[PDB]
Amino acid sequence: AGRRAACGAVLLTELLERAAFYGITSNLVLFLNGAPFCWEGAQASEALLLFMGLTYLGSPFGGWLADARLGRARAILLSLALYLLGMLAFPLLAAPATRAALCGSARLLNCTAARCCSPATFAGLVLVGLGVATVKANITPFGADQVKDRGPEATRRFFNWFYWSINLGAILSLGGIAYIQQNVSFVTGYAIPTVCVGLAFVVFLCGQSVFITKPPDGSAFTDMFKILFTEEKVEDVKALVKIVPVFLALIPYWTVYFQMQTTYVLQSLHLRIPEISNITTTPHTLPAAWLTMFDAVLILLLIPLKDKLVDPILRRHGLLPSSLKRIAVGMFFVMCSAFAAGILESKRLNLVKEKTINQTIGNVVYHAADLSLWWQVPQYLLIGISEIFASIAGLEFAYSAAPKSMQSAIMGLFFFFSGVGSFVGSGLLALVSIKAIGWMSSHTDFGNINGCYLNYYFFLLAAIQGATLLLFLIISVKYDHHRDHQ
Amino acid sequence: AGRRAACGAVLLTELLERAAFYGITSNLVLFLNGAPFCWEGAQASEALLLFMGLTYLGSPFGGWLADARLGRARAILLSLALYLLGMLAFPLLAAPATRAALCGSARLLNCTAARCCSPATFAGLVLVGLGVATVKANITPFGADQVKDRGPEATRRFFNWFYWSINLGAILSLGGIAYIQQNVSFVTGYAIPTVCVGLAFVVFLCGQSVFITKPPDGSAFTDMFKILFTEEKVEDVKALVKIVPVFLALIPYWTVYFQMQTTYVLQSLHLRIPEISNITTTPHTLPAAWLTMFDAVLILLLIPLKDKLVDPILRRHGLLPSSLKRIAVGMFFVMCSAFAAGILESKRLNLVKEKTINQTIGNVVYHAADLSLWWQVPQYLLIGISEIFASIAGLEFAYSAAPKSMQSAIMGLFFFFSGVGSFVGSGLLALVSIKAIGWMSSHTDFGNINGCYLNYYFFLLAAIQGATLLLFLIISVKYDHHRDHQ
Ligand SMILES: CC(C)C[C@H](NC(=O)[C@@H](N)CCCC[NH3+])C(=O)O
Ligand SMILES: CC(C)C[C@H](NC(=O)[C@@H](N)CCCC[NH3+])C(=O)O
């Protein structure tokens, strides 16, 4: 022990940061379709798409800022400051007293009659995305540096609870904050994540007195020679060009898991959801963020079992000693869950032809089938086993396979390739929606999937995941042969 | 080279042996339901079940005979002699001139009116099964001993063409011999496999002059001490008790692949099969052995591609150096094929509700769907990739992981555990047919599956295969750690 405070402070900072981030993405589309904006669905979705795109693209640049110029701690503080500065825009816009201060004074109430307060919300989204980008690429290596002098097992044990805190903040946001934004006063609904950001900044500032920081290395990126003589700078390029194919093969894995995360909630919208006695009935409604947290809850339950039972057994039996093998196991569980979801959708698509029941979730009617929502339990347990096997392993791999000088930059490139996979998954979803292929071609997301073929999409995702699993297993052997052999 | 004749003779012997064996099992049920016997379907199926059971149970005993008493070459010759002696019973029974010599003189022609010539056919089946049992357990180690002094790569290359010859004899039997037994004169239909057995015996006798044999070791099994001091006899037990869990975990793999081999042909019976111009039309009919060889043809096509392209690349890239990893890859392909077959059956079960077409294969009407048989091409290509990855690897593993003194016995135990898996698969098929579970509960095999749920059975087989794949991958690491480390 001894360094328990330096880890707890980073865990709390990441928890609050993820809570605020999943608060801004849980009801942003519904907020843009409201009194102050009255935007259309296309632009409302494009706003969140550009937000996540800036978050993914900005992430590497945040690592370069934390490595070449700043010390990866002042970088986190500055990024959290820019994050908090952009967080006030949403409560200031939702408040009628300050909506006049932001831009004009929004008159449109029933959306009877092209964007209002566009620069304000766009600057807020840009600053929030850049803040999340610079934080996520610098919070995992700086957090793992607190226990780096104890061995890789300490970093893995820390990353376990790091992921656990990320999906306890996500549950606290999607469960509590989103329900507040959906049914009760909205100004406080957006003010709570801002308070979370402020508390995270304060916690990091107080924890700076016990953190073990590293001085910046400015003359590290200028020595990326590409024409072929100081030493220890050649190895930083040899250890960098060898980890690129791993991320390239992980891109389609991100594609499959992001499309699965979207389509799983989309399918959960079309199942029989039980009514909470007096929480989702009149005059309130059930938020969709709970259907989204249906998999963070399982992860939160699962992680303590892996850290206490699975990891010691696998360590004392010599099973899965490297992170790449755990990533392969996670991808196998991902394709298994995709096949299970395809089976469940094939069974569900036969029930909607006979009888459909109407349910209201997002103040909209969904024609669900006569099938309990708890039938998604196996398909969610499988992705729960996969993320605790693939995501934590990928994080500790990006932390360990990176050079000592370039860590935040490599983590930012990891998140950027994850975002590239997400965009490839969006393009794949748009590809199967053409007139040639009738799979998922009724309308855009959050609609009616009774006329679509989601089981075929799940089977295609499973086949793709299996192919990229074989590819990753092929390239994993070619990479582990240079870790302790060459 | 230099030893090309000693390998070609064993390949031809195995080819003819497998051809005769797959000739006796292609139309045995239809033969027992005919003029000389007029048996019922239950006893006709029980006869083949007991035949295969004696084949599987007898296999280890054949290895003990080839190791403790005989020299594994005289054992093969004696087993082939007993095989040929039991092969004459079927042509002698089918011939009207000798049917009176066998037992009485069978009068029942239209089966108007409890077994006729029961001792004759039972003794023939018993002797043929014991012959196949003693041959299969002694033909692979004796055949692999011709190239054992060149390295494991030579044994793997030999086993490739060994499997290729096994499924070229199977095609020559199911394609040519079964079509002769189905439409044209039946006496010659059963006399052809007997000629094949005689030719195999003659070929082995002529090739005995170039085979490299091993003297028998009688004092090898008496030293299986189980209470706990000559050396090299303790290692023979340590290398024997360690390979038992591998076979125990391979048992459910055999269960899944035997049930798949049965249900794949059963599903192929319910698809649109094109008519050969003047081969399957009046007055002839399409044999089911061709629908069964639909996967041996693909294997025959695939094997030369693996021996010439896949193996050199995997060798020069350090990929899959052990047989257990290839077995795991084969099991992964098996579960992938099971999922694909489940998808295809889910698509097929929706077409039979609208329109069904009638087709005659075994002189019986099948209500097939309006779906081409060539849609089974992916599900058969996957099992083709699996067998060339799992079966050859399992054979070379049973040959290499066995002690030098006990090889045929270990191969016989391998085939016995395969048969145990087959019987477990039969019990599993009988388990899902209870009144509680409506999966495959219309009737016995070779019937109507339009009222059954074969897609659910395929999904269950896929889940079981994945579970046993994870188990095998877990136990594979615990076994490879004592090959070159301990
Ligand atoms: C791999 C990264 C990009 C994703 C990771 N996701 C989670 O932690 C989820 N378990 C949270 C669930 C909320 C929506 N389904 C992350 O948070 O960074
Ligand atoms: C693993 C052993 C027991 C099976 C093996 N099977 C084959 O070779 C098939 N490819 C033959 C196909 C004919 C019926 N589908 C064997 O022959 O021993």
Curated annotation (Swiss-Prot), chains A, B:
GO cellular component, one term: endolysosome membrane
Signal sequence bounds: none
SUPFAM superfamilies: MFS general substrate transporter
Gene Ontology MF annotations: dipeptide transmembrane transporter activity; L-histidine transmembrane transporter activity; peptide:proton symporter activity; peptidoglycan transmembrane transporter activity
Expression across tissues: Highly expressed in skeletal muscle. Moderately expressed in kidney, liver, and heart. Weakly expressed in colon and brain. Expressed in low levels throughout the gastrointestinal tract and in Caco-2 cells. Expressed in retinal fragment epithelium (RPE) and neural retina. Expressed in small intestine, stomach, duodenum, jejunum, ileum and colon.
Phenotype upon changing residue 387 to K: Abolished transmembrane transporter activity. Abolished interaction with TASL
Keyword Transport included in the entry's annotation: yes
Catalytic activities: glycylglycylglycine(out) + n H(+)(out) = glycylglycylglycine(in) + n H(+)(in); N-acetyl-D-muramoyl-L-alanyl-D-isoglutamine(out) + n H(+)(out) = N-acetyl-D-muramoyl-L-alanyl-D-isoglutamine(in) + n H(+)(in); L-alanyl-gamma-D-glutamyl-meso-2,6-diaminopimelate(out) + n H(+)(out) = L-alanyl-gamma-D-glutamyl-meso-2,6-diaminopimelate(in) + n H(+)(in); carnosine(out) + n H(+)(out) = carnosine(in) + n H(+)(in)
Family: Belongs to the major facilitator superfamily. Proton-dependent oligopeptide transporter (POT/PTR) (TC 2.A.17) family.
Subunit comment: Interacts with TASL; leading to TASL recruitment to endolysosome.
Protein name: Solute carrier family 15 member 4
Organism: Homo sapiens (Human)
